[PDB]
Amino acid sequence: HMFEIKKICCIGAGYVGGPTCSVIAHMCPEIRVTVVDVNESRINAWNSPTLPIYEPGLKEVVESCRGKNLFFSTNIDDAIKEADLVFISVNTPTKTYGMGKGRAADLKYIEACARRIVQNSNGYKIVTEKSTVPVRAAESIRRIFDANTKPNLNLQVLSNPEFLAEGTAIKDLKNPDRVLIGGDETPEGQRAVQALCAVYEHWVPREKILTTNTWSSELSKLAANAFLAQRISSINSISALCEATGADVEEVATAIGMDQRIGNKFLKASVGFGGSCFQKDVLNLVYLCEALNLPEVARYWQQVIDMNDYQRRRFASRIIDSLFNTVTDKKIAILGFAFKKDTGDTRESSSIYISKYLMDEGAHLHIYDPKVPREQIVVDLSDQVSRLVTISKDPYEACDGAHAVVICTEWDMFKELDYERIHKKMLKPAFIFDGRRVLDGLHNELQTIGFQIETIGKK
Amino acid sequence: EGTAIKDLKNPDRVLIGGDETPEGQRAVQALCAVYEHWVPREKILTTNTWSSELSKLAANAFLAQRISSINSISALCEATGADVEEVATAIGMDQRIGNKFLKASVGFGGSCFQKDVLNLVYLCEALNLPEVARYWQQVIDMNDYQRRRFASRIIDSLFNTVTDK
Amino acid sequence: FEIKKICCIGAGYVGGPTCSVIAHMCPEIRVTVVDVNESRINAWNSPTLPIYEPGLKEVVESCRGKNLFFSTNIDDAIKEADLVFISVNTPTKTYGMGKGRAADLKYIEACARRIVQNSNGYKIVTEKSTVPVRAAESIRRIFDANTKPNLNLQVLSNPEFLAEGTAIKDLKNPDRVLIGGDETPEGQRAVQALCAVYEHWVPREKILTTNTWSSELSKLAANAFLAQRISSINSISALCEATGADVEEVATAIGMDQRIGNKFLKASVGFGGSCFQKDVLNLVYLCEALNLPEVARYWQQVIDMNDYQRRRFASRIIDSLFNTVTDKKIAILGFAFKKDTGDTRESSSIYISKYLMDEGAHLHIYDPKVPREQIVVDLSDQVSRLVTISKDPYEACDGAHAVVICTEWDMFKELDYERIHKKMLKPAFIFDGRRVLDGLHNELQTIGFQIETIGKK
Numbered sequence A: 001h002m003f004e005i006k007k008i009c010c011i012g013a014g015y016v017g018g019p020t021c022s023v024i025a026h027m028c029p030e031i032r033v034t035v036v037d038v039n040e041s042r043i044n045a046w047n048s049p050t051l052p053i054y055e056p057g058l059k060e061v062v063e064s065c066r067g068k069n070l071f072f073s074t075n076i077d078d079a080i081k082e083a084d085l086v087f088i089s090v091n092t093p094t095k096t097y098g099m100g101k102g103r104a105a106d107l108k109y110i111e112a113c114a115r116r117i118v119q120n121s122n123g124y125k126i127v128t129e130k131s132t133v134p135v136r137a138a139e140s141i142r143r144i145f146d147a148n149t150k151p152n153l154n155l156q157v158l159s160n161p162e163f164l165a166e167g168t169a170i171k172d173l174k175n176p177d178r179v180l181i182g183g184d185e186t187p188e189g190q191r192a193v194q195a196l197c198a199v200y201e202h203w204v205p206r207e208k209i210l211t212t213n214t215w216s217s218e219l220s221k222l223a224a225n226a227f228l229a230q231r232i233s234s235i236n237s238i239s240a241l242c243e244a245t246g247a248d249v250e251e252v253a254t255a256i257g258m259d260q261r262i263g264n265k266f267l268k269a270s271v272g273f274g275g276s277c278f279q280k281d282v283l284n285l286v287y288l289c290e291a292l293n294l295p296e297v298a299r300y301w302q303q304v305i306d307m308n309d310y311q312r313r314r315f316a317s318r319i320i321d322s323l324f325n326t327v328t329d330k331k332i333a334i335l336g337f338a339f340k341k342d343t344g345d346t347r348e349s350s351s352i353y354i355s356k357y358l359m360d361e362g363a364h365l366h367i368y369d370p371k372v373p374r375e376q377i378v379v380d381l382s383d384q385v386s387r388l389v390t391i392s393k394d395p396y397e398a399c400d401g402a403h404a405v406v407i408c409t410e411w412d413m414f415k416e417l418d419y420e421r422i423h424k425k426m427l428k429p430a431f432i433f434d435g436r437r438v439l440d441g442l443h444n445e446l447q448t449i450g451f452q453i454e455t456i457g458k459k
Numbered sequence B: 001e002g003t004a005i006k007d008l009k010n011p012d013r014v015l016i017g018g019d020e021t022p023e024g025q026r027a028v029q030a031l032c033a034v035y036e037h038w039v040p041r042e043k044i045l046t047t048n049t050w051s052s053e054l055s056k057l058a059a060n061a062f063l064a065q066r067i068s069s070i071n072s073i074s075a076l077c078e079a080t081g082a083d084v085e086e087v088a089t090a091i092g093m094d095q096r097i098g099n100k101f102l103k104a105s106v107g108f109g110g111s112c113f114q115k116d117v118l119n120l121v122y123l124c125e126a127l128n129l130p131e132v133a134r135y136w137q138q139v140i141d142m143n144d145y146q147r148r149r150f151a152s153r154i155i156d157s158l159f160n161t162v163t164d165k
Numbered sequence C: 001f002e003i004k005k006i007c008c009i010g011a012g013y014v015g016g017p018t019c020s021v022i023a024h025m026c027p028e029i030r031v032t033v034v035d036v037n038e039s040r041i042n043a044w045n046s047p048t049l050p051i052y053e054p055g056l057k058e059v060v061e062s063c064r065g066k067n068l069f070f071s072t073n074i075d076d077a078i079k080e081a082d083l084v085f086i087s088v089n090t091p092t093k094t095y096g097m098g099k100g101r102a103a104d105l106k107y108i109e110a111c112a113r114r115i116v117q118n119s120n121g122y123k124i125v126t127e128k129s130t131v132p133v134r135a136a137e138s139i140r141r142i143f144d145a146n147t148k149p150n151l152n153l154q155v156l157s158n159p160e161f162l163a164e165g166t167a168i169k170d171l172k173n174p175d176r177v178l179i180g181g182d183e184t185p186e187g188q189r190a191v192q193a194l195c196a197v198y199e200h201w202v203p204r205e206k207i208l209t210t211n212t213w214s215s216e217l218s219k220l221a222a223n224a225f226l227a228q229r230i231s232s233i234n235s236i237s238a239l240c241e242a243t244g245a246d247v248e249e250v251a252t253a254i255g256m257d258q259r260i261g262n263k264f265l266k267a268s269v270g271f272g273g274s275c276f277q278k279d280v281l282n283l284v285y286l287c288e289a290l291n292l293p294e295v296a297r298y299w300q301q302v303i304d305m306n307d308y309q310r311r312r313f314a315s316r317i318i319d320s321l322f323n324t325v326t327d328k329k330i331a332i333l334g335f336a337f338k339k340d341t342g343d344t345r346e347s348s349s350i351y352i353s354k355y356l357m358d359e360g361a362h363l364h365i366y367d368p369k370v371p372r373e374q375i376v377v378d379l380s381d382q383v384s385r386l387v388t389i390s391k392d393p394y395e396a397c398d399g400a401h402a403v404v405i406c407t408e409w410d411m412f413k414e415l416d417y418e419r420i421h422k423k424m425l426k427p428a429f430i431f432d433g434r435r436v437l438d439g440l441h442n443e444l445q446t447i448g449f450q451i452e453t454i455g456k457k
């Protein structure tokens, strides 16, 4: 007795669902993969020459498969009805009111997907929740399925967290450090788990596939994300200590990271981490711990967010202090709005928070990013936006007549700008605030040109 | 300790700080020449004395933090029916996290870790960095909680009387 | 299954009277009460019982040596018993987690191990106390881990509702009997066997059966409700003093509501006894351990109010005696925690005496039943200088500045207050902490006393 997945439906065509299913289709030519979404313009973009997200290599993966065994559709109902495997990869926004307001994930879209699946399903199907931050997701799906049975309907629920990082999604999906699958410790659960393993074994060695139960799967993802965020907050805390004592956080990070028990990754100090994963993940971990009467664990992990918030505030107040605490009507260029390089995603970007701190001081911001759409920047910063915010088409326009240049995202193009040209047209003193350490090694040239260079973790 | 000889014979790195003066660099180079009898040159890092000491204080604290972090997850595992050794395996297979120093325990000891974090916290308070101080203090508070929770599990299992047992 | 031999481990205020009544009502059952305390056992076998309970002497002497026995041979009484009661004391922990609050189960656990060591075959083991705190569970824990072939021990909970001073009346006509046992065939068979004992004199409709935890929780809660009524009326007594009302009149108006009831509304210097304070302390501690802090601080108020009532009475005494009691003689009438017992555990008289001693008062303490050595122990060098224990109440009042009534012994209402006033120092004060002199106020004022009482200005 086993189950072979021949048709996959993925509900959610976002940063998780789109790339993941495109790689599955690419690696499994005999499996039909249909990605569905309520958002019609997003589906139309997936079917166009201009994809709705920017991921290096994604266009090539999509175009090698689309229309052969990879499909993007708004017909959610028919995709479910015919699927052997249904992924749920939707967003779980933070509650904006009620218990856990601003902290706890809202499961309403997961629950609506589960209800929609029952409505449109007959026979046997595997339903797998796949997200970067699963918060009681498998349990809520099972609760709906347990309460809404039909004769001969047999739905299995798996957890399959997604470990990809945006901007490296395709490389991460093709060579994952591990694949994590959680399922019930019953004959039915193990048959479903094996079926999903067989999909991944088309390109992932078996020794890199971990199998467990659904809760251990979700807790492992929640903890792993928090460990990553903690490394960043830890090295950022050291960056403040370096600034206060004359050390350089990049040199300290190198010495730390050469301990093979620590490792040398995720030790790059920055204005602060962003993205839809880390802050949401730690907030939900803290909230969960409070609900379980584990306040010591809750306040332990809360420090990861408190440190990130302090790192952002400290960076902004250095900018304001350098401008002698009045920035009313001063032009300031913001270079980089995405939460990291090589994506157009801005969710929880530090650039949003730095911009708002400067807007509260009356700065006239000119914002340039090579990939973030103009309209997204307007939405993220929302009358005050109308008065203070300009979206520049190129970085020289943003810097023309500026008092300060603030680098918030580590796009490689920023280290190659014509900084002699930028200096000529800035007001003096002309400041560069490197919130990403991308201008390291240009410091002598920039000082010779005449800039005041300030960067995180060095004074 | 316990692996001193192997650690001394094959260190991950040697860290030497000295003044950024001609005399300081002559001294640094003399000490480098000792270690180069058995340590490859690419594993010897040289810096100034403060950066050297700060790097050690921070590196020790990162190690202590990994333990308190996995110990905090161990309490969450006990409360929810998961197994911290399995969760640790899943975490440690991320090559950006690494798989070392994720062994949950009654709590870390030794003459290094607690003293190191306490002095780091004290230094931060003296420099008017209270946010950094309370960030690192959690490493100690979690370790103290881990020990207390273990003892009270023992006492609870003995039904809260241990007199003459 | 018919219970024919009963062993009770613990010959105290609970074990002694309960088994004596069982023996009285069940002539076909051999009842053996055992204890490690040899002098206590010898007293139970003597013409002078080790505790004072009205009517107990008559009950014991009609049974002792016929089907009621008191012995130090714990091992053989267990070995032969069909049913073993455990009625031992669970003192509050004096160190460690829950110090001063949580009950120490070490004696319950030692009894459970001793029962396993001396048992074969089938026995029912029943924990009986006024404050059971996880007692049945800890006994089961021991039995479950120490099995023998053909050994079959059943664990029941059977909390004791009697109040001291009315033990015999309460045991013979209980408002209800509460038995907890497992919801298994074996548990229900054991429950029914214990029911069959009580049905010799208790109507079946007054016997409640449930599981062991519900039984213990019900007792913990019931004790706390009773204590709360006392603290509630004592809190109103302070408001009465502050506003010119009389708490006895207010209590009457309150108690005529049949939804409130008219019992346990007698304001006092404060409740005492080994039950109420221990019960609330353990309830609060349990709630904190279950992450129920709102419930914990709700019940804590019962104790805080009781402590406040004692402090307020004591400072009223000092205020009335011109803000100073140094070198003043004060008679303390009543040391037991309530009338008709010699028991002093948590008696308000202890606390009142200590407050006055710390202010330099010379106490002359009289109680008709509390032994002299017990008073010395309860108040413990300061005792040597300041405390005298009198043989009669007129000697305690001889040359006194004030008389403080702490226990509502009926004999206090009938004292020769004419004679008492003559040899007291003047002005002569009476501090009635029990409302026992109500209605004598006119006669006492005419004699010349200054009377101050709880719940009236």
Ligand SMILES: O=c1ccn([C@@H]2O[C@H](COP(=O)(O)OP(=O)(O)O[C@H]3OC[C@@H](O)[C@H](O)[C@H]3O)[C@@H](O)[C@H]2O)c(=O)[nH]1
Binding pocket: A011, A012, A013, A014, A015, A016, A017, A036, A037, A038, A039, A042, A089, A090, A091, A092, A093, A109, A110, A112, A113, A130, A131, A132, A133, A134, A276, A277
């Ligand atoms: O009921 C729904 C809800 C949502 N959706 C779709 O699901 C898609 C989700 O895509 P997003 O780009 O917003 O989100 P991601 O793919 O990046 O998910 C990631 O970030 C959001 C977090 O809540 C998740 O934990 C994480 O996996 C959207 O396009 C949305 O239209 C549905 O089709 N149906």
Ligand SMILES: O=c1ccn([C@@H]2O[C@H](COP(=O)(O)OP(=O)(O)O[C@H]3OC[C@@H](O)[C@H](O)[C@H]3O)[C@@H](O)[C@H]2O)c(=O)[nH]1
Binding pocket: A132, A162, A163, A164, A165, A166, A167, A225, A228, A232, A265, A266, A267, A268, A269, A270, A272, A273, A274, A275, A276, A277, A278, A339, A340, A341
């Ligand atoms: O050393 C670092 C690394 C990362 N960062 C910042 O941390 C934030 C997160 O960066 P990541 O590369 O982890 O990107 P992501 O948020 O897309 O992925 C993260 O969450 C989803 C998980 O599945 C991934 O495993 C995890 O890396 C970015 O703002 C980044 O700039 C640092 O500031 N310093």
Ligand SMILES: O=c1ccn([C@@H]2O[C@H](COP(=O)(O)OP(=O)(O)O[C@H]3OC[C@@H](O)[C@H](O)[C@H]3O)[C@@H](O)[C@H]2O)c(=O)[nH]1
Binding pocket: B001, B002, B060, B063, B067, B100, B101, B102, B103, B104, B105, B106, B107, B108, B109, B110, B111, B112, B113
């Ligand atoms: O995964 C782990 C690792 C370690 N530990 C505990 O952490 C404590 C420290 O153990 P270590 O192996 O680090 O031993 P040490 O304290 O001697 O060395 C530590 O401090 C001195 C520094 O120079 C070393 O680099 C550092 O490892 C021990 O109590 C150990 O049992 C864990 O509980 N879990």
Ligand SMILES: O=c1ccn([C@@H]2O[C@H](COP(=O)(O)OP(=O)(O)O[C@H]3OC[C@@H](O)[C@H](O)[C@H]3O)[C@@H](O)[C@H]2O)c(=O)[nH]1
Binding pocket: C009, C010, C011, C012, C013, C014, C015, C034, C035, C036, C037, C040, C087, C088, C089, C090, C091, C107, C108, C110, C111, C128, C129, C130, C131, C132, C274
């Ligand atoms: O292991 C023991 C412990 C105690 N005992 C005896 O058990 C007897 C208990 O008698 P006590 O007068 O002290 O106590 P009580 O009968 O009044 O119990 C009551 O008050 C004490 C509280 O802890 C109980 O909850 C309550 O039922 C003592 O005589 C003691 O010597 C044993 O025989 N064996």
Ligand SMILES: O=c1ccn([C@@H]2O[C@H](COP(=O)(O)OP(=O)(O)O[C@H]3OC[C@@H](O)[C@H](O)[C@H]3O)[C@@H](O)[C@H]2O)c(=O)[nH]1
Binding pocket: C130, C160, C161, C162, C163, C164, C165, C223, C226, C230, C263, C264, C265, C266, C267, C268, C269, C270, C271, C272, C273, C274, C275, C276, C337, C338, C339
């Ligand atoms: O109205 C009252 C009633 C009682 N009290 C005081 O409250 C204290 C307790 O008195 P009780 O009559 O309840 O006597 P006990 O403490 O022996 O019995 C109590 O605990 C044991 C349980 O089994 C009983 O059911 C419970 O009444 C005494 O100090 C008494 O004087 C008042 O102050 N006012």
